[PDB]
Amino acid sequence: LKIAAFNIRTFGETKMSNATLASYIVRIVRRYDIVLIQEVRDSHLVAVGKLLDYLNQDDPNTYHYVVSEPLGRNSYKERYLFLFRPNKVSVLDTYQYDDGCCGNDSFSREPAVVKFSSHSTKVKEFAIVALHSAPSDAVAEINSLYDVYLDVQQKWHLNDVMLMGDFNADCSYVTSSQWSSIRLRTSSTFQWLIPDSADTTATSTNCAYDRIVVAGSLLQSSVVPGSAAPFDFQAAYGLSNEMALAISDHYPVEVTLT
């Protein structure tokens, strides 16, 4: 099973309306059984609907989806979009993490949580926790995912959970001496599949912003060793830097389950 988390810079109407851009997006998505899309700036679901049009153009059930409400604390809002192949996986349950709220809420974009059924893999049931952190508050946010894990355990009684997304987990946003502050890192319950030395950005910076974390021995046993990696689409398609950048400034991060 192939899973990815992809931050598509300003995913929306304007972007999906460009057939050249749309075409590459479809391409990327089709590589996966499950894909988490972030930075969905689409209040009326027009862009999401254009994407599904393309994905299901030949079969109405190529891809199914789960979308959250537009989330954010200030005025700027984004959705979490999960696309999945219904022939591979099934959605058992979903819930939005209740963070509070104002002044008290712990996240700009509280995590969407989805429980999947996967018959082809070792793990038969697992949950994915999505997080697109706020740069400014990266440390606090990643640290709070430890509380989300707990919430999942209390609700579904499941230990098998994959935490993923654009955590802004490197460079200016999470510096060297701040890892101490993050429970999701200091607790050995969790394995970080994308290492600190990985480059998940399409621009010239070298930062491991995008990450994949897993908890659960059944899930941890299901990851194919060395499969977790950012997907450099620029290299893959022989794109120009300006063309790679018009797609996104981030690479998708993927992992394979067996």
Ligand X SMILES: *[C@@H]1O[C@H](CO)[C@@H](O[C@@H]2O[C@H](CO)[C@@H](O[C@@H]3O[C@H](CO[C@H]4O[C@H](CO[C@@H]5O[C@H](CO)[C@@H](O)[C@H](O)[C@@H]5O)[C@@H](O)[C@@H](O)[C@@H]4O)[C@@H](O)[C@H](O[C@@H]4O[C@H](CO[C@H]5O[C@H](CO)[C@H](O)[C@H](O)[C@H]5O)[C@@H](O)[C@H](O)[C@@H]4O)[C@@H]3O)[C@H](O)[C@H]2NC(C)=O)[C@H](O)[C@H]1NC(C)=O
Residues classed as catalytic: 78, 132
Contact flag: residue 238 with ligand X (CB under 6 A): no
**Contact window for Ca ion (CB under 5 A) among 120-128, 167-175, 201-209, 226-234:** 201-209
211 membership: H or E segment, kind and range: strand 210-215
140 binds ligand X (CB under 6 A): no
Q: Which is nearer to a second copy, 188 or 197 (by Cβ)?
A: 188
DSSP assigned state of 20: H
d(CA 231, CA 92): 28
Tell me whether strands 2-11 and 34-40 are parallel, antiparallel or unpaired. Answer: parallel
Could you say which of ligand X, Ca ion, a second copy, none residue 246 binds, taking C-beta under 5 to 8 angstroms by partner kind?
ligand X
**CB of residue 246 to ligand X, shortest distance in Å:** 4
C-alpha–C-alpha distance, residues 231 and 138, integer Å: 23
The residues in 170-199 that bind a second copy, with binding defined as CB under 8 A, are 183, 186-189
CA 233/CA 250 separation, integer angstroms: 10
Q: Which stretch binds a second copy (CB under 8 A): 101-109, 146-154, 224-232, 243-251?
A: 146-154
Position 242 contacts ligand X (CB under 6 A):
yes
CA distance readout (Å), 112 to 116, 145, 164? 13, 12, 11
The binding site for a second copy (CB under 8 A) comprises 150, 153-154, 157-159, 183, 186-189, 217
